[PDB]
Amino acid sequence: QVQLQQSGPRLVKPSQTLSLTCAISGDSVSSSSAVWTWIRQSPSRGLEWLGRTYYRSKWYDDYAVSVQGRITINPDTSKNQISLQLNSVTPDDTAVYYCARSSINIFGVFVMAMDVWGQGTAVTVSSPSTKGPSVFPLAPSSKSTSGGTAALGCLVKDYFPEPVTVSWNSGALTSGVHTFPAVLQSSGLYSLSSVVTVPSSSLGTQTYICNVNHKPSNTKVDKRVEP
Amino acid sequence: ECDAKCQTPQGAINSSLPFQNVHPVTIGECPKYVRSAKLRMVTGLRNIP
Amino acid sequence: GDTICIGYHANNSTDTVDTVLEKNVTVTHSVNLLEDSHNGKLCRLKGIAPLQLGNCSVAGWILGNPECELLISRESWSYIVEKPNPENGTCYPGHFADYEELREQLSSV
Amino acid sequence: EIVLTQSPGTLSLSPGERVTLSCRASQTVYNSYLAWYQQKPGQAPTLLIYGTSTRATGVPDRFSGSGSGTVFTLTISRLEPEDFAVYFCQQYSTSPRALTFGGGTKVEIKRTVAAPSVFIFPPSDEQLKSGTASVVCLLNNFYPREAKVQWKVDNALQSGNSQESVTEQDSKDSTYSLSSTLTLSKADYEKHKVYACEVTHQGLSSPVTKSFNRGE
Amino acid sequence: GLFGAIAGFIEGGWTGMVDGWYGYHHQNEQGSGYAADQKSTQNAINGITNKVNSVIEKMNTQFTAVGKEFNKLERRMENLNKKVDDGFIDIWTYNAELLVLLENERTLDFHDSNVKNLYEKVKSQLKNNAKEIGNGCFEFYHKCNDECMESVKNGTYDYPKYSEESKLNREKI
Amino acid sequence: GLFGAIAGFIEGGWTGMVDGWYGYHHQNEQGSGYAADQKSTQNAINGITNKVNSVIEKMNTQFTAVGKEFNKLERRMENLNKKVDDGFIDIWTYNAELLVLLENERTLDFHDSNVKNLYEKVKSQLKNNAKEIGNGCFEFYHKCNDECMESVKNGTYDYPKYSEESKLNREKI
Amino acid sequence: GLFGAIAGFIEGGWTGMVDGWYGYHHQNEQGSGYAADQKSTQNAINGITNKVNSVIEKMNTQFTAVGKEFNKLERRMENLNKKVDDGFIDIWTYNAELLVLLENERTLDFHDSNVKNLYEKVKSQLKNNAKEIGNGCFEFYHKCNDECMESVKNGTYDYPKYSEESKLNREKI
Ligand SMILES: *[C@@H]1O[C@H](CO)[C@@H](O)[C@H](O)[C@H]1NC(C)=O
């Protein structure tokens, strides 16, 4: 069938050039029966169209009025891929980025829908103040674990910009994990916490290590929670 | 174990099209058989690049 | 000076339809009213299954031929099927009265 | 620009209940250029409906579109567990070129009311050497999403020095969890002894409070 | 080309306009690019879909059958059986294929209308602010930005505003 | 709206004109009031009455009957009997209901013509003595009494007489 | 007269033009005489010949027969025999004669188009170099020899050449 493979999670300094590449498999890129459309998605501004490309004996380029003047969607007939250029990236542009197809035939009219999707790209634009998080251990009190559950956790404080990837025990620990969305403290630095329900009969026979990573500021901390 | 609204000596007929040319021997609510070999009608425009 | 235009559709299509005046008029998209294909396998017409006779015909089926002990089975049917050249019928020669007139009778039960 | 608006924002329906999602347009979208999508949390959306009521390939028959003009409506005949997802309608104009979306509609699967297990943690001694003191309270595995937390420093109700956030509907038990932080300075933490975190929830017969004492 | 637009003075279908069946291509200072028209397009898709749905869904087929076997001694009736089938396969074939061409040429002398229908709105909106080029376009006698262009396509084009500048350039020509 | 007048640039059917199907409303010094046009109307009533009379009176029905009883042992023929009735009730139903829509849309793309037909006579009679308002009306550039109005509707409108006064007011605009 | 030309503002078919179905009559210094148009004519003969060939050659007739004799004791079937013939002679008669009128009025509202189609090419070629007389003719505002006339009929009429002389005589009028 038709699959769209995109670039990995990128990271661009402010005011630089964003460059994402979409690979098409199973469909000729110059197919007169398919359209290539880019759409980005932020949690705040929701889904937003960016631009579309297509070939009818020649290539065309149409971009939404929100990005007119700093965006280009170039194809490549050899690699069977397309790309996206977003120059002068601001903090507004930190979001996901997809690529589309369209075999949505309406007697030749196109609905402008997406019958083929791509998994997505983590596009984080860093800012002026790049600060790493201070990851403090949330050790449980000596009485809140006498029940059936011990509550461990790690505070992730004073970092910017978002987001931060949290992983317990380098990934193996997955049952009972809970990572809350970051809240914007009064200092402009996002704050985030992540806890985990584990049996109280294992706080001395199992080491607990939360692995925190803030990609825009190279930070990678390995703090061990000791109850 | 298919289900159809029409049945011919060669096989069923699924679509709600108003004409068929598979076989004149039908049974059930069937597109009335016609001698046509092609019944394409225009829904767009003349292809004039 | 600035130019604005009026124009219509075109695409990679090679379909051609025929009209009252000219034929092979290439159109951008067309639709077909005619159904040309089957599936090669019988189905449940009306919703309920049909009666499959196989090697035996309607005669021996109602006559219960000793070699059709495999299809005195079905207690509801919307139509009957049989091979174009039935092999096991009225094993003993003789005239079956009003035979053709009964294939429309037992046609559906 | 045509910005869509869907109602309700977040809905909680039991499985099998008929789900109706309206799609209100800021101006008339034509019967041909409406497309719908069903996005699972984290996964990219997929085509559910295009045109106006044209079922996309591989989409079951419970979904069915309807409407015209500036009123469109999404409809699931029998809600399913795999329909825990946010649904977006999508329009496309042609002059000027516009292809926008709406606010999205989260379809939460309604479950029973669950009593939250509370936990509490004092500010770690590592942070006390950084000047800050952050008491962290916690709830877990409760429903519905609404709850109320009141920090009490020395039986004094706090206000303005605490923030909270709730997780999405869990993928296994369909419950939420709530965390409340008490970010204080080092001077305001040592000035007080007892810290109370009070919780009122629908499943809590009475407000269950867990407390500790600084320096103990 | 009944109305004279399709394969008429507009000799070319635009391969680049894929949003719809009818539209405009503008060329001004700020740039160029096609744009399709929804008022004209959607009225046509909906009407034609229904015109297709019309002939499809008026053939009411009762739950019946055809296959009849006759004894070798009812051949006159066995011959009569075929006559009743052939007569329908005579009629339902003739009437259908004649109806196809009809609602083909009736479908080609509809799009020709709406193209011609569109022209005599844009032409009856400027009326002397542009001289008609004849191949299906206009040359504005005045500078027209994308905000002016977009009014020509919508239907709220301003004649009094860009009229004073029109006479000064039409006087030039 | 094929020709583009009915539900076109003339967006409203006049509830006040009951003498005919097409007419004019004039507004001048001496007063106002609708007035229907007989040349256009009568050519349409007579043609349509005949178009109705056409499909009615071409179904030639012979003095025959349908009700046939068959013995229980001619069921194959009793089944054949029904097939001969259903096949007609198949055909005469399909062909009729498709013909209705046809000579419906053929009857709606006739009145649209004559309205458009009428416009391009009144518009091609003044030709610059009035500026077209676009909603299906005219604004005369000169005083036009009821004796001048009545010539526009008849077909003997005087261009040379009211032409000298036209240029003096068209120069004003 | 749908399009309004045939029996419209062109009230007379020219008995003198026998080369084709559409043409022009010019009157200048060098003389006069009719002349028929082949682009318009041939597109019509070929399309109509095919439209005739269309209905003719879609009646597929199988090698069969009708004459059946029944014994006096199969009268119910002998009555059934006639019903199968009359029903066809019912249908194939109704459908045919309704199709005739249709593709008659469809053939009269085609020639009316092409006459009207022709007019709005010659009228959209001079555009002010001649004032339209209304009966289906033009009066050139300038001397036009047979070499100028022949360009109007072909389709390569020169507007810039005979434009300077047009304004000096249009100013006279
Ligand atoms: C059934 O048919 C086969 C051959 O087709 C034959 O050998 C066999 O004897 C038949 N049986 C009966 C009971 O007629």
Author numbering:
A (entry chain H): 1 to 31, 31A, 31B, 32 to 52, 52A, 52B, 53 to 82, 82A, ...
B (entry chain A): 276 to 324
C (entry chain A): 10 to 54, 54A, 55 to 83, 83A, 84 to 95, 95A, 96 to 115
D (entry chain L): 1 to 30, 30A, 31 to 95, 95A, 95B, 96 to 213
E (entry chain B), F (entry chain B), G (entry chain B): 1 to 173
From the paper:
We describe two genetically similar VH6-1 bnAb clonotypes from the same individual that exhibit different developmental paths toward broad neutralization activity. HA is a trimeric glycoprotein that is critical for viral entry and is composed of a globular head domain atop a more elongated stem domain. The HA head domain contains the receptor-binding site that engages sialoside receptors on host cells and is highly diverse among subtypes, whereas the stem domain carries the machinery for virus-host membrane fusion and is relatively conserved. Two HA stem-directed bnAb clonotypes, A and B, were elicited upon vaccination with H5N1 and H7N9 from a single donor (Andrews et al., 2017). Both clonotypes were encoded by germline genes VH6-1, DH3-3, and Vκ3-20 with the same CDR H3 and CDR L3 lengths.
We describe VH6-1 clonotype A, which started as a largely group 2-specific clonotype and then gained cross-reactivity to group 1 through somatic mutations. However, these VH6-1-encoded bnAbs all arose from a group 1-specific germline ancestor, making clonotype A unique among these HA stem-directed antibodies. To better understand the binding mechanism of clonotype A compared with that of clonotypes with a group 1 origin, we performed X-ray crystallography analysis. The epitopes of clonotype A and those of other VH6-1-encoded bnAbs that are derived from group 1-specific germline precursors largely overlap. Indeed, while substitution of Gln for Leu at HA2 residue 38 of CA09 (CA09 L38Q) had no effect on clonotype B binding, it drastically diminished the ability of clonotype A to bind to CA09. Somatic mutations G100cT and S100fY on CDR H3 would stabilize the conformation of CDR H3. Specifically, mutation of Gly100c to Thr100c would help to rigidify CDR H3, whereas mutation of Ser100f to Tyr100f may acquire a π–π stacking interaction with Tyr49 of the light chain. For example, the side chain of somatic mutant VL A51T forms hydrogen bonds with the main chain and side chain of somatic mutant VL V30aN, which in turn forms a side chain-side chain hydrogen bond with HA2 Asn46.
